[PDB]
Amino acid sequence: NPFTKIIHKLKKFIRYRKVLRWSRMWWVLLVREIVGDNTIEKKTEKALREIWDQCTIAVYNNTLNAVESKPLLFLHGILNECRNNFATKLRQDPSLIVAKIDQIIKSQIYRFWVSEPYLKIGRSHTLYTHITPDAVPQLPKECTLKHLSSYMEEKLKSMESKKNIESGKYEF
């Protein structure tokens, strides 16, 4: 059982080494979008990185297009694969992992994960192992869900509060 664990850790290195450069990179951004400047657990990343790796293994076997040639096809493929892979596994989400990946798909703010600072890491020759949160530059504030969420406060509750009236409390 440790020997079988070793080869199937090797089989993500002999094949799949090009996607896990783009995969771990899109996961470092995703943990920042889910958590957003709070202390992340270094131990249960590993439980959820294995589910995210199995999303990218499942998508890259379904694509004839290259990852470097057309990268956003994979973000629509990988995030939706783990929008459902987290939903069929994670029962309770206190950090709302299924719920936030819902709104990254529905609001299309994942286009910032593929940008001119971000396309340089995925082209470069770094093993997945070496892709750390320090290697990933942070998105600007406008591209975190926080800012977008807070921008949905302001809109709705400026108008949700203008839902209806006390009708006579208003004096002159």
């Binding site: 079988t4 199937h8 089989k11 993500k12 094949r15 799949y16 957003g36 400047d37 709070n38 202390t39 294995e50 589910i51 199995q54 999303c55 293994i57 499942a58 076997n61 379904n62 694969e81 459902n84 892979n85 939903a87 069929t88 596994k89 994670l90 029962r91 309770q92 989400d93 206190p94 950090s95 709302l96 299924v98 719920a99 936030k100 819902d102 709104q103 529905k106 869900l145 926080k146 977008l148 969420s149 807070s150 949905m152 406060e153 709705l156 949700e160």
Partner: protein, 156 residues
């Protein structure tokens, strides 16, 4: 010197840097509405629990672990079952509720360490100590204070 009065003076005259240690401790403790009993809750549609979720298969997890040149990871039975039962009555309501305002409110609460239907004051560790925030008083100007200024030094 009192918990309630200082936040009325934060806009007017004095900043956050000149408060006492016992004043910063008091402003991060919860208000008097905490400890006051109120057994009322509502809108039990939380995005925390997933109704489509299932157990670990332990045969699929064995199969997905060996990297097996496979084409799909999840099970897709219970997540197509929830898609079918959603389509049963065309959704006059919810084709555009529950995909909008109730989602972004509960997401912003999860960044503050607040549960989804939780109407009361909730802690979150900022630096070395805890700050009790709620939906109503977000205490955002304190979180800007105890993250920025309290990088190197200690406050209680």
């Amino acid at each position: 010197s009192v918990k309630d009065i200082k936040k009325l003076i934060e806009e007017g005259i004095l900043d956050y840097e000149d408060l006492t240690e016992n004043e910063l401790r008091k402003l991060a403790k919860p208000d008097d509405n905490f400890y006051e009993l109120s057994p009322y809750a509502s809108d039990e549609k939380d995005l925390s629990l997933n109704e489509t979720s299932g157990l670990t298969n332990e045969q699929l997890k064995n199969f997905l672990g060996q990297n097996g040149t496979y084409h799909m990871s999840y099970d897709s039975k219970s997540i197509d079952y929830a898609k079918q039962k959603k389509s049963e009555k065309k959704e006059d309501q919810q084709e555009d509720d529950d995909g909008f305002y109730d989602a972004y409110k509960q997401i912003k609460n999860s960044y503050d360490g607040i549960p989804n239907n939780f109407n009361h004051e909730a802690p979150q560790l900022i630096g070395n100590n805890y700050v009790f925030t709620s939906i109503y008083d977000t205490k955002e100007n304190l979180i800007k204070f105890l993250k920025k200024n309290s990088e190197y030094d200690l406050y209680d």
